[PDB]
Design a protein around this ligand. Sequence first.
Ligand SMILES: [Mg+2]
Lengths: 51, 51, 51, 51, 100, 101
Amino acid sequence: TVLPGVEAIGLGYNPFISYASVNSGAVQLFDWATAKKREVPFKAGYFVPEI
Amino acid sequence: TVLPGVEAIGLGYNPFISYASVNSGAVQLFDWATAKKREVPFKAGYFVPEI
Amino acid sequence: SLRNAENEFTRIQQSINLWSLRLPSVKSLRELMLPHMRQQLDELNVNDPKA
Amino acid sequence: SLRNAENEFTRIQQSINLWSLRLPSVKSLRELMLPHMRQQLDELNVNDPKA
Amino acid sequence: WQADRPKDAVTDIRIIFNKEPTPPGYTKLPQDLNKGAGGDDVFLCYKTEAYNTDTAINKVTVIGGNNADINAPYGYLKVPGDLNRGAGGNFIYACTFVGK
Amino acid sequence: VDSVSASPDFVDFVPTIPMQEIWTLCSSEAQAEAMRKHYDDVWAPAQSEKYRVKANYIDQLVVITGGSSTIEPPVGYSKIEYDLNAGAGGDFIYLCYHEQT
Ligand SMILES: [Mg+2]
């Protein structure tokens, strides 16, 4: 499974419209459905892009 | 399993922004997903990089 | 004559934090971006400020 | 006339400690660093202070 | 409301006096609003139009007082000519309001 | 709280590296400088203006001449407390204001 929040990082963003929210900022820029995935060391069964 | 905290050591860090927290300091510098792992002597089944 | 007044106010804030995601800003990050986004970026006619 | 006042304050701190991780700062540690971080470090044009 | 085929008698209004004749298109009301007050004879007239939701007078009111000029409410325009022109008592003026 | 453990949402920044400029991702320094220059000179000024707080302000002043403490200004206006002849003879004159909401 993907780690929750990996869809939100890399989101194109506007800093002026509002404070930290997914509703400030447009669309995901990165193909992280397809990148090489590493398991996160402190949660077994959860993966993120190696980057 | 990795010992908790092995993801936090080697984290690139800024000492001025705040006292000891993972939120001061940027990104992990070291490949310790891939380094040679030793079991930690006082916790069976937990491993760390040999370094 | 009698006058009797009450005022009451409460404010509560609660916060939970869970894991942070960081992205290292390495130059190879451009290769991970979605291709339609990449071509949209580099087709930008920066000769037009309105674009 | 009657005046009646109370003040109350409490402070509590609790702390738990568990194992510390140390890193020996040997010269071979550079070989363990992530490659994109390594090239990002040594591509740094230190001729520019802004970089 | 702006029901279908709306109508409007009051794009603008004017105060008219001394029994002088109005220009056309202004309907003039017959009563002297100084009858027994003395002064000049004074009357009111208004011009009909098609409705447009922003030239049509949305609200109308009257102001008056001791001062010869008296301030209309915010956004209202007072109509020139005293509604007690030469008469006794307070100075009085009609006021009109339009939505922008 | 159980749902937060299963499905946390983006709530806050990591204050050290919260976000990166998009032209860092550019192919080319000429384009990247053009984007930076336009961002600096044009777009960020406009956006900071666009979201600057459009605070309430005075619409108009008018003056009321009721001559006493009893007076109340025209409809929708608010009077200033001191009359402009306090301690003098004559009528108590009060300044009053409308504020554009
Ligand atoms: Mg004075």
